[PDB]
Every structure is written in C-alpha cells, then in structure tokens.
Design an enzyme around this catalytic site. Structure first.
Site, PDB file in Angstrom:
ATOM      1  N   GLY A 173       0.808  -1.195   0.000  1.00  0.00           N
ATOM      2  CA  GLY A 173       0.000   0.000   0.000  1.00  0.00           C
ATOM      3  C   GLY A 173       0.855   1.264   0.000  1.00  0.00           C
ATOM      4  N   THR A 177       2.327  -0.104  -6.022  1.00  0.00           N
ATOM      5  CA  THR A 177       2.220  -0.170  -7.462  1.00  0.00           C
ATOM      6  C   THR A 177       2.793   1.087  -8.062  1.00  0.00           C
ATOM      7  OG1 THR A 177      -0.021   0.768  -7.488  1.00  0.00           O
ATOM      8  CG2 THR A 177       0.176  -1.629  -7.333  1.00  0.00           C
ATOM      9  N   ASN A 217      -2.491  -5.057   7.832  1.00  0.00           N
ATOM     10  CA  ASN A 217      -2.653  -4.634   6.448  1.00  0.00           C
ATOM     11  C   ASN A 217      -3.814  -5.371   5.821  1.00  0.00           C
ATOM     12  OD1 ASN A 217      -2.142  -4.266   3.500  1.00  0.00           O
ATOM     13  ND2 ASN A 217      -0.216  -3.399   4.216  1.00  0.00           N
ATOM     14  N   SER A 221      -0.358  -8.724  -0.401  1.00  0.00           N
ATOM     15  CA  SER A 221      -0.106  -9.832  -1.290  1.00  0.00           C
ATOM     16  C   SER A 221       0.529 -10.952  -0.536  1.00  0.00           C
ATOM     17  CB  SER A 221       0.790  -9.408  -2.436  1.00  0.00           C
ATOM     18  OG  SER A 221       0.143  -8.478  -3.262  1.00  0.00           O
ATOM     19  N   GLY A 443       7.897  -6.883   3.078  1.00  0.00           N
ATOM     20  CA  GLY A 443       9.061  -6.949   3.966  1.00  0.00           C
ATOM     21  C   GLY A 443       8.768  -7.857   5.160  1.00  0.00           C
ATOM     22  N   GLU A 445       7.352  -9.545   8.448  1.00  0.00           N
ATOM     23  CA  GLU A 445       6.015  -9.542   8.992  1.00  0.00           C
ATOM     24  C   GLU A 445       6.050 -10.013  10.426  1.00  0.00           C
ATOM     25  OE1 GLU A 445       2.559 -10.350   6.476  1.00  0.00           O
ATOM     26  OE2 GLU A 445       2.222 -12.110   7.610  1.00  0.00           O
TER      27      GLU A 445
END
Ligand SMILES: Nc1ncnc2c1ncn2[C@@H]1O[C@H](COP(=O)(O)OP(=O)(O)O)[C@@H](O)[C@H]1O
Ligand SMILES: [Mg+2]
Lengths: 729, 375
Positions: A173, A177, A217, A221, A443, A445
């Site tokens: 986020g 992108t 989050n 992904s 990255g 977690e």
C-alpha cells in the site's frame, strides 16, 4: 530538480539548513546535546540511568541510555542521504525522515536505499521534465528519487551491460504499485506499452486471487512477484513477463482472527447473482468449512463491487465469459472441498464417506467422477514403474489430501490466470536482450506472535536481505578497491547466514523448519514433540532463542534480522502438509469441464516448507544473477493522514526494511569518507597549523593535519582521493 | 547427488529383495535372493543368453535352471552370489552408482558376525560405498508401523523374529529367533499336497508350492468346525493356477499349515508355537514394560498377510497375557514391505548420518568397525 517554486520540484528539492560552517563549536551545542526525541543536555550519569535536561520542555529527567543518542549538528536537517550524518544515530535519522516527509520530501536516500514514504496524495514530482532531470545524472547530483535509481539501472544495462533488478519491498500500500510504475514510466520515456494496460487490470485480478487481509494490512499480497521488463540490446523497452513465488496456499483454507482468506472467495459468495450461485453451487458464508471464522466483512467496503470489478478487468484481459465462470467454478469447488469430511474409523482411517454430497458438489463443478475421486483419495495409488502401489492413507491424511487439493487447485488456477496475464503482456516479437527484474514483495512480517506462514515469510526475507548485505559489502569494498583502503572487514551477509541455516538447514542438525519436516513424517508426531525437538536441537543453534521454563511448552523465539520474534507452533504439523494425490490430478485431466482439463492437461506430497525453499531458491538465484537496486516502502501513518509521520511506525518499518540494520553495516565501515582537498577545507578552522585549506602535497598535508587532530588510525584510512572515516569521526 | 549423499535402501532375504532409496514410498523392484545356473550351460535352445541368472531371471527360467540360495534364517551361503544379488539390485534395477550414494542393509535379529563380515567387506571393497548402515529388520518394521515402542514381531518365510522395544532395547534372550517360519509351512504344504495327490520333487517345484501358499493360505479361527465346513469341494475349495500350465487344487488344507505355526504338534513336534515363544520373549521384560508391549503389539511379515491372522493372533495373545493389561495388535496397511519402509524412513532422516559407517572408518579399523560402531 532543484526549484521549490515549481510544483514538480516543490516536494523534491531539499530546502534546508545552509549555515555552511566547518567549526564544530559554531554548528553544534557546547553541551552534550541529545519514537521522536526531545532536545536534551546530559547532566549526570548514574549508569544507564542518565539524567538529562529535556531542553525541549526544560525538564530535568532521569532517562535510560536506551533513549539517549548524540544529536547531529542542525546543518544535517533533512539531508538527501541519511548516510551524510556525522554520527549515524537513528534518533536523528528518524527526525530527518519526519522533517523531510513533513516538508514534502517523500523520497529519501539512506545509504543504498531509496526510501519512499507514502504521502497519501498525488505529488507532481515525477513529470517528464523530472525524467529529463535525472536522465544521465549521477545519482547524488539530484534529490532522491526512484527516477535516479531507474536511470542508474538503465545505464547499467545499457552502458555497463549488466542485468538489473529492483528490490522494492516493505509495506503493501505504501507506493506499492506506484513505485513500480515510477520505474516503468521513467524508462517509458527514456527507453523509447499498450499491453501493460492489461497488466494494470491484471493487478486487481491477482489481488483477488493473491491478496488477503491481516491485522496490520488489509490488502497484502500473499506472494512475491517480479516484473521482467525486456530491453532491446540498444536500450529500449520491447516487452515484459511476470512471475510469482511463494504463494501462501494455506491462506486459501484457513484464516485467523482478524484475517480474511484470498479475497476472491468473498467476492464470489457475496457478489454472485442468484443465477450464478445456483450454477456455481454457492452457499452463504456460514455454509463452508473454509472461511469459517466470524471475520468475514470489512468495514465500509463492498465485495459485490469488487467482485464485479474483477470480472470487468477479466473481460479486458480477454477471459471468455465461460472461462470467467469456469474460474469461478474452481473457486467454488475449493470451498466445497472444505466441506468434505472423512469417516471416523478407529484405524488411521482408510476413512469413510457415509455422505459425500460435498464431494459431489465439487465433482459437479469439475465434471469428474466422484466415485473415482473418492476411491483414490481413500487409497492413493503411487506409480512406481510398471507396478503401481495402492498406498492406503488414514482419514486424517485423507482430510489433508482434500485440503492439499484445494490449495493445489487454487494455485493452479492462479497460475493459469497468471499465465494468461503473460499471454496478454508478453508480446511475441521482441529482442529481450536484457532486462529489469522489478521485484514486488512484502518486507518482514511481525505480529505479537507469529506462525508458520510468517516464519516462511521472514525466512524468505532474510534470504533476500542477504542479497543486500552481500551486495552492500561488495559495493563498499569496490570503493576500497578504487581507493587504497585495506579494511576488508567481513562479508556482512554472514550475519544472516546462520539465521537462514537455522531454517533451511536439512541434514546435519536440523533447523527449525527441517524439524517440522521431520515431525510431519512420523505418523504419531505432535506439535509438542516438535517443540521438544527444538529444545533438543537448539543447543547447536546460536540464532535460536529458547524460551522460558513455562513458555517452552509451546512457544519459542528466533533472533531474526528484523528483531526477535516469538513463534507459536501449536499447530504447525497441520500446516506443513499437502498430501496431493495425483490420481485426482489425472482425473482432473480427464475432466468433462475442459477448462479444468486444460488446467491439468499434463501431469508428490513433499512439504510446504520444502516447496518454498525451492521456489525461493529460484527467485533468489534469478535476483542474484542481476544487480540489486534497493527501494523501500513506508507507512508513516496508518490513519492516512497526509503529512503526519509517526516515527514509531517508521522505525519499526526501517528495521523490517533493513534500513536500520543497513545503518549498522555503515557503522561498521567508514561513512564519513572525506576528499583530501575537502579535508583541508573542513578541518582548517579545526587546527590547521602548518596546513591551511590547500597545500601542495595532497596526501601528506592531510595526514599532517590528522596528526594535529591526533586521530586514531583504526578509525580512518588514507585512500587515493578520500580518507575514509568511521561514524562519529 | 554427486556432492550430496541421499542414501539407498536394500532389504534382501531368501524370500524377497526390495530395491529402493531413502524417502521412497514403495520398492522399485522386488525379487528373491535366488541365483540360477543352467543344467546344460553355454549354447541352449531355450535360454536367456546367460549362464547365471538372478532374482526374477532365475524364477522366470525355473525349468532350465538349478536354483541356488545365497541367503538361507538369513545366513549367507554364497557371498559371491550375494554380489550378484546386489549387482542386480543397485546396477540393474536401481541403476545408481554405489561409489556415490550411501547404502542401507537390513539384518535379521541375532545375526552371526560372519554374515556382518561378509556384507561389510563386499560393500566397502566390491561396491565401494562412501558409507553403509546395517539396520535391524524387525526394528525397521516398528518404525514403518508408526511406533517407537511395543512388541515387534516379523514373521515371513525366511525366519520369524520378535524384538520388543521399550525404554531400553531387547538383549540376546528377549529377542526371539524362531525356527518355525513359512519355509516349514511350505514344505508341510507340499507333504499334505501329496496326501491329496500331488508331487513336488525338484527345487523349482518346491518354490511353486511356496507360490501356491501365497494366494491360498487361510488362517482359521476354529480349525475343527471350519475343517468340516470347508469340505465343500466346490464352493469353498479353491485351486491355484500357476502361470505355466499347472493347477493345484486345495481344500480345507488351506488352513492346515497355519495350525503348524501355532501348534507344531500338527507336524509331530513338541516345539512351542509362535505365540508361546513370543510369550516366552515377552516374559523377559518387567511387568510395567510388558504392559506397554502388549498395548502396541506390532506384527508384520508374510504370515500376517493371510486372511484371518488378525483375529487369530489377537485371541492367542490375549490367551497368554494379563487381562488387566491393554492388549492391541498393530496391523499396518502395508505389512509386506514394512521392513524396507523402515529403512526408507530412517535413511531419509538426518539421524542416518549418526548411524552409518564410512569407508574411511572401515579402511582404518577393518571389518571390526561394525561392532566398534555398534553391536
Ligand atoms: N498377496 C499376498 N498374500 C499373502 N502373502 C503374501 C502376498 N504377497 C506376498 N506375500 C508373502 O509375504 C511375505 C513377504 O514378506 P517379506 O518380509 O518380504 O519376506 P521374507 O522376509 O520371508 O523374505 C512372503 O512370505 C510372501 O509369500
Ligand atoms: Mg515385515
């Protein structure tokens, strides 16, 4: 790239402190000047209990050394590259980051890192003018920006003939992108398409099949991916091809509290029309084993729209209406697989199915023979050679075989879609002489306690940060080679090496994950016995942290790169499974639904950990064959309050991005490296004596000044054009 | 591969030889430890272009070959033909380099040192292997059953053993070595087939009898009443069609041989039966120990592949066991290759590295390295 009056440089150029004065007394407080930190003066040391005067508020307060670092001179306010600090203390790094973000300076350098902090608003600072401002410019000449990095990469491909990659990672986020697009757009202009419109539509499709919701989050992904941009031998963009690794398949069959499985499962049940639900055998959210948990909805969101949105994207992508439905038949049947439960026989059950309606539902959608399906699951047959051996399995294993199938089917489906993305994206005719592998991955977690999924993620991450440590070391040594610096030190990737082996290490004393493999092979192994194996083997693991006398009944910790993490391991033997029966695979090849037949048009068990080791290796190797460029993604504020930055959230991410640790590597080298003539200029007011700010013998003159300064030889080293200096020196 | 180990598994024996490797699910190839030699030799009308046939080759050409038994109990009679067996195993079937992948050999409980010397020498001289481990047959079956403790009975044609596993390990006296295996039931079957009216003079015909046993031998629960019942020479009587042109019809004799296993008096001996010699070995353990041993009574082997054996053995064990103790026989879904499976398991585990013997160790200590590693 240097004019605040223009909006394209307004949130770019570092308008800061320009006192320009080399005397340390003039540009720094005479007193011991000291997750934001208050201005303070050290008053008394009583051990770690150091009393400081909190000058910020005028408060003489006893404070632990834990929160006390030397504050750098005001002249370093918001520098372009955090490595430019005299003493690399993260208290001032955090403040520069706070100041910079507040001032609009979203892009920040930190050693090798291109730090991008999410502004939560559109900033003009990426225009074609700006592209030209970085076009052919030597990094440091211009303010921090991905474009500079992209420039570097491009010309490394073009001029140096070296394949590049973008290791972009951090928090999903945070310009996820965007950052990718920045790289593409930079070179869209310089290295000069239509088929990436489809890739833009593929993104949200793959989010439906790849992203999930978790605690920290809601759009993360659950896989790593990279974009191979293909370049013409003369330096032009001619195409692109993407690939994914390490799909968290367990996410399709389980969800924890405050989590959601892959979004598509919700999109489909909620957004399907009644006609669709009938045709797809869709039931409600409480009618499935999979998706079981009360955390189904997301506040202020709507799956209906996102469902439709995905289908609209799929239409753009060239999915035939029937393919779209067939895809959803698979999705549905995965959930119906969840509903398959075995007989409760008191041997390890061959199992039993008094009522296999759920399986019939699955085989309806697949177009396969439910009795062949069932039978082969009851007793899996393994082809040896000419002979085939009916390897009967237990009912628990049969249950796992169903979940294995479910996971496998989801992945196959994912890969199919992924392939179709490349069919659209990857133009046929093209030179593809070189490439830019843009890596898009999360990255570290860390939650209050982590599980298997996170173990594999952090394992992954350390492998990838090893690429950084290794690369960084080389780059540092490259300058030492350019110069006359003999401090070889040590390959810093070796810091991760035992942490990596702690997980990866197979034969020889097993690591953690290898023990899990062991434990998932013996029939009566338990998760308690897994923990007991950790207790036995951890005496040989320097990076493993055995937990407390009571705590070691289940949980234990690992000394990770991003900080020590506590792991649960109460149900890891139910995770590291995947009994995929290829009799079913064959049956699926033999499906009446030809979509399914195509999914498996051609054709054991192993472990999930092992599978990730393989996929990771493939990714890492590919990345190591290139030259790592480093970009990091930060969320300054989870409220999305544009302009607000909480150093709490940031420092956490700096550690999880490897920035904070990157600083430690820099602390172990020579950050302050001063040019011989510069040195004379920097230290003239600081005790020139015989040598002013210019002198005939370039090298000796500086040395004479060093002698006047009385510096320690272990803190510096005479080079060819620079004298290398350690942090704080 | 090349640089990495990955061990191999070879479970030999006079019955069947199972070829495989570490982490394998099922044997790649299965053939008896039997080597055949032509009666004529050299130039023949009907031969396989060899003067020496191994395993399936020997059993495919029974009509022309004299069948030798390099393994007889599990005792090596011809260590030269043992090399032929392992040649067939590793070179022909597995097709792997022994000068590369460590190997794993199985061993019947209470195995004479002479056999260990023969096996060890060959592997580190003829097939030169980086490391080789010798594992206890029966104990491997225990692991295959998914247990780490309990009675470990392994009963086939070669020889019947029992190795109870507990806190400690069974010593040479709690380990059963029973001279009453399917071999004896095979020869007894032959005799009582002559009672019907059949004749099996030659060694090849002796093997045919064993092949007949495989697919007919039924374990009765009530011999007397089932003997009368199975008199139905029509509905319950069943023949064995030998793929060659020979059909041998057997009636209620199908469950006459098993009775000799339980009661050698059916042969004419006063020897204790398989469940009595098992009981004898159980009594070598403590009261607390034998309770757990009964709780997990693992059984495998050829004699446990016959219908009815599950209920019959359970009855017999409870007949010779305290009623206050938990008594449950463990019957894996795969009791034919249970020993080989155990080898595949342990070989795939990292513990193999702490059990194997390397060629260097052999070269230094010689054959004696076997006992120096473990007895
Ligand atoms: N279908 C079958 N039914 C019953 N017994 C069988 C069957 N197939 C094989 N067997 C028997 O199982 C036994 C194989 O066990 P194994 O441990 O390999 O033998 P051994 O140790 O005597 O060499 C042989 O006695 C064989 O005749
Ligand atoms: Mg056995």
């Amino acid at each position: 790239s240097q004019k605040p009056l223009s909006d394209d440089e307004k949130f770019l150029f570092v308008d800061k402190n320009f006192v320009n004065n080399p005397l340390a007394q003039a540009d720094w407080s005479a007193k011991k000047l000291v997750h934001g930190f208050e201005a303070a003066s050290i008053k008394e040391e009583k051990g770690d209990e150091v009393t400081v005067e909190l000058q910020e508020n005028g408060k003489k307060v006893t404070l632990s050394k834990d929160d006390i670092q030397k504050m750098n001179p005001p002249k370093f306010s918001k520098v372009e590259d955090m490595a430019e600090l005299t003493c690399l203390n993260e208290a001032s790094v955090l403040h520069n980051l706070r100041e910079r973000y507040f001032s609009g300076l979203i892009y920040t350098y930190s050693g090798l890192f291109c730090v991008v902090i999410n502004p939560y608003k559109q900033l003009p600072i990426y225009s074609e003018k700006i592209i030209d401002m970085y076009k052919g410019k030597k990094r440091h000449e211009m303010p921090p920006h991905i474009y500079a990095i992209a420039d570097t990469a491009y010309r490394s491909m073009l001029q140096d003939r070296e394949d590049q990659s973008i290791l972009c990672t951090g928090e999903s986020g945070a310009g996820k992108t965007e950052n990718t697009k920045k790289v593409i757009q930079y070179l869209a202009v310089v290295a000069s398409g239509e088929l990436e419109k489809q890739l833009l539509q593929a993104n949200p499709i793959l989010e439906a099949f790849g992203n999930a919701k978790t605690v920290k989050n809601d759009n993360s992904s659950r896989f790593g991916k990279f974009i191979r941009i293909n370049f013409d031998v003369t330096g032009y963009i001619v195409g692109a091809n993407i690939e994914t690794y390490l799909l968290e398949k367990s996410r399709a069959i389980r969800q924890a509290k405050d989590e959601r499985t892959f979004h598509i499962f919700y999109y489909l049940i909620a957004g399907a029309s009644e006609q669709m639900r009938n045709d797809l055998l869709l039931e409600g959210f409480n009618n499935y084993t999979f998706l079981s948990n009360g955390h189904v909805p997301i506040p202020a969101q709507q799956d209906d729209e996102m469902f439709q949105e995905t289908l609209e994207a799929m239409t753009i992508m060239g999915f035939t209406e029937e393919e779209q439905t067939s895809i959803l038949r698979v999705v549905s049947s995965v959930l119906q697989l969840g509903n398959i439960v075995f007989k409760k026989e008191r041997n390890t059950d061959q199992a039993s199915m008094p009522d296999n309606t759920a399986a019939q539902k699955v085989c309806h959608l697949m177009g396969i023979n439910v009795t062949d399906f069932t039978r082969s699951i009851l007793t899996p047959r393994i082809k040896v050679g000419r002979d085939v051996v009916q390897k009967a399995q237990t009912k628990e294993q049969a249950d796992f075989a169903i979940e294995a199938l479910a996971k496998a089917k989801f992945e196959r489906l994912f890969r199919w879609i992924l392939t179709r993305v490349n069919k659209a994206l990857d133009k046929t005719k093209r030179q593809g002489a070189s490439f830019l592998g843009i890596l898009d991955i999360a990255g570290f977690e860390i939650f209050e306690i982590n599980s298997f999924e996170q173990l594999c993620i952090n394992y992954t991450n350390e492998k990838l940060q090893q690429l950084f440590n290794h690369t960084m070391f080389i780059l540092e040594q490259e300058e030492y080679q350019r110069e006359g610096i003999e401090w070889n030190f040590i390959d810093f990737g070796l810091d991760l090496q035992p942490c990596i082996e702690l997980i990866e290490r197979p034969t020889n004393p097993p690591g953690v994950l290898a023990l899990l493999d062991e434990e998932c092979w013996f029939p009566k192994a338990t998760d308690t016995s897994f923990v007991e194996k950790l207790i036995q083997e951890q005496g040989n693991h320097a990076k493993f942290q055995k937990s407390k006398q009571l705590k070691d009944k289940t949980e234990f910790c690992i000394l990770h790169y991003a900080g020590k993490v506590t792991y649960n391991a109460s149900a890891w033997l139910t995770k590291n499974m995947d009994p995929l029966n290829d009799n079913v695979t064959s049956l699926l090849n033999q499906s009446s639904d030809k979509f399914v037949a195509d999914l498996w048009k051609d054709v054991m068990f192993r472990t999930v950990g092992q599978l990730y080791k393989e996929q990771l290796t493939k990714l890492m190797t590919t990345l190591r064959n290139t030259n790592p460029n480093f970009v990091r993604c930060i969320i300054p504020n989870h409220e999305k309050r544009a302009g607000k930055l909480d150093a709490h959230l940031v420092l956490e991410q700096l550690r999880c991005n490897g920035v904070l640790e990157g600083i430690r590597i820099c602390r172990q080298g020579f950050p302050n490296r001063i040019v011989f003539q510069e040195f004379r200029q920097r230290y003239e007011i600081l005790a020139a004596n015989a040598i002013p700010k210019g002198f005939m013998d370039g090298k000796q003159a500086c040395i004479l000044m060093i002698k006047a300064l009385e510096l320690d030889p272990n803190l510096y080293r005479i080079g060819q054009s620079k004298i290398f200096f350690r942090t704080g020196v | 591969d090349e640089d990495e180990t990955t061990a191999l598994v070879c479970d030999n024996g006079s019955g069947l030889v199972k070829a495989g490797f570490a982490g394998d699910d099922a044997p790649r190839a299965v053939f008896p430890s039997i080597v055949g030699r032509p009666r004529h030799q050299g130039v023949m009308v009907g031969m396989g272009q060899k003067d020496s046939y191994v395993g399936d080759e020997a059993q495919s050409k029974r009509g022309i070959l004299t069948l030798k038994y390099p393994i007889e109990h599990g005792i090596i009679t011809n260590w030269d033909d043992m090399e032929k067996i392992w040649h067939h195993t590793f070179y022909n079937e597995l097709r792997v380099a022994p000068e590369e992948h460590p190997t794993l050999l199985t061993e019947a409980p209470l195995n004479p040192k002479a056999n260990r010397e023969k096996m060890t020498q060959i592997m580190f001289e003829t097939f030169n292997v980086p490391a080789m481990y010798v594992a206890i047959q029966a104990v491997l079956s225990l692991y295959a059953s998914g247990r780490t403790t309990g009675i470990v009975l392994d009963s086939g044609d070669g020889v019947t053993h029992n190795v109870p596993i507990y806190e400690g390990y069974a010593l040479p006296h709690a380990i059963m070595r029973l001279d009453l295996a399917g071999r004896d039931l095979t020869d007894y079957l032959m005799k009582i087939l002559t009672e019907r009216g059949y004749s099996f003079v030659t060694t090849a015909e002796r093997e045919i009898v064993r092949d007949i046993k495989e697919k007919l031998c039924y374990v009765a629960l009530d011999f007397e009443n089932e003997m009368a019942t199975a008199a139905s020479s029509s509905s319950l009587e069943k023949s064995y069609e030998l793929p060659d042109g020979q059909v041998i019809t057997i009636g209620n004799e199908r469950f006459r041989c098993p009775e000799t296993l339980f009661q050698p008096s059916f042969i004419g001996m006063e020897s204790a039966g398989i469940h009595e010699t098992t009981y004898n070995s159980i009594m070598k353990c403590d009261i607390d120990i034998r309770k757990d041993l009964y709780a997990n009574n693992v059984m495998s082997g050829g004699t446990t592949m016959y219908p009815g054996i599950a209920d019959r053995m359970q009855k017999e064990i409870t007949a010779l066991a305290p009623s206050t103790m938990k008594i449950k026989i463990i019957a894996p879904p795969e009791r034919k290759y249970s020993v080989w499976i155990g080898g595949s398991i342990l070989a795939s585990l990292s513990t193999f590295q702490q059990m194997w013997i390397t060629k260097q160790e052999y070269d230094e200590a010689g054959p004696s390295i076997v006992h120096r590693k473990c007895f």
